[PDB]
Amino acid sequence: MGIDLKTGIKKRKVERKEPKSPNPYIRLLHNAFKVVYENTGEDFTKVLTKRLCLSKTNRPVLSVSRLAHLMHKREDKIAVVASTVTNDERLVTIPRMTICALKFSATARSRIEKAGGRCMSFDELLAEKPTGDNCVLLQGRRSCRAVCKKFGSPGRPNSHVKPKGEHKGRRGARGRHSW
Amino acid sequence: PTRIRKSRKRRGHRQMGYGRVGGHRKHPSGRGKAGGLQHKRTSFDKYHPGYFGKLGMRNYHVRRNIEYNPTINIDKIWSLIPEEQRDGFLQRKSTTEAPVVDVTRFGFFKVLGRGSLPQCPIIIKARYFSSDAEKKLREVGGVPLLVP
């Protein structure tokens, strides 16, 4: 009692600590990597566990073409993704690479199996390289959602976003002096 | 399900989350979208530019299948060829047995020029092309054609 605790102190913050998903595979993986980090203190494992706790809206997908373009100076390393890897038909040919992901499309899996690559699961990554030796951690673009592009106030002079519905008039939509 | 709803956790509290001074009344601001230029002017100006007024010419009956116009970019062309034929054609950069693609048979009218092409001759038939689409095609050894 009788103490001042609101003068140089801010309110607490809330962060995720558990995956939140019913899928038992993700719970198992999160717990295993948390144990590994507890017993080694490595940064790769810490970031991996944090990523495994993220929500689906914060885990964008990654294409094979983007993966190829990102492995230009490091073809011998292992690409690690905490999301699904999809196919890119726009790319006629793909090189040989090693990728570890949560999921693969059937087409992406088959394309990687051809060309001599290897598709890896997080279970095998834990079995072989628990601390991520010779591994690169990658993610997609978090601002690519269509919902993200409509945040803000369309009618203000300094915003650069569009209104949400369909608008047919002219008042305030044809320059700074349309009002 | 009603067991897990927020309203069931307000039994015993008298006003159910609507306040004492204000309270829950019927229509304290009006019905629908009324008041857009009067007491709701700030809301409409912040979020809905171009809501009031007219703009452009009017067509009394739009012909919906005349305005239809699908398009394909030059970087999606090779995905129309199945994989086995794909590797066969790519291996031999033949000039006498080049693949012939008719995008109208796949449901497209005009060809646009986003992306790039594999370095191999090809013949593409469409009803229209963009300026750059033709330029990129001829730099890879292909030729464009117009199909009925």
């Binding site: 106030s153 949400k164 519905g165 | -």
Partner: peptide, 30 residues
């Protein structure tokens, strides 16, 4: 500040009187 797209649904007609404008599909299997 509420930022929503405006609804484009018509108000109901003939709800307590007049012709019956509600169609149910309980007889689909039959």
């Amino acid at each position: 500040g509420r930022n929503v797209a405006f609804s484009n649904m018509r108000r109901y007609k003939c709800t307590n009187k007049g012709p019956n404008l509600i169609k149910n599909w309980f007889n689909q299997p039959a």
